[PDB]
Design a protein around this ligand. Sequence first.
Ligand SMILES: CNc1ncnc2[nH]cnc12
Ligand SMILES: [Cl-]
Length: 150
Amino acid sequence: GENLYFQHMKHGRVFIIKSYSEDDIHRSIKYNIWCSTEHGNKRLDAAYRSMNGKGPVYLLFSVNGSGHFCGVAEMKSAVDYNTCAGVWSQDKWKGRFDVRWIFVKDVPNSQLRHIRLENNENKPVTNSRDTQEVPLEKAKQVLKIIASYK
Ligand SMILES: CNc1ncnc2[nH]cnc12
Ligand SMILES: [Cl-]
């Protein structure tokens, strides 16, 4: 058989999201919202707005030190930078944007550590920092691995 679904798109951008907090992951799944750092929010906002709805901005979530990704979400709005403070575990985040979680599933780093990022010094995708962008051809490979893991 074959899965040629992901191997076909050109308009799409994909970012790693790191979270120190398991509580924040749960709150994001529950309420379909997220917030990054200042520079992270700016990165995501720029990608969402220049995508202008002609493709998805995907977010690959991983809790720092957990050893695995925990799921996939799509950005669903621009960054609102002036919102209620202290809704996350730490009060160091300013703003909010909408997401839609697509997959909630733990995927061990062992399944993904062979994919390396030419834009991040050929480092494994599993050694990324928050809002590291993933080149589309590597992003396709990661997404197929996540969707097929069981
Ligand atoms: C709510 N946003 C976050 N929560 C915990 N850790 C992080 N690292 C980057 N963004 C976050
Ligand atoms: Cl704003």
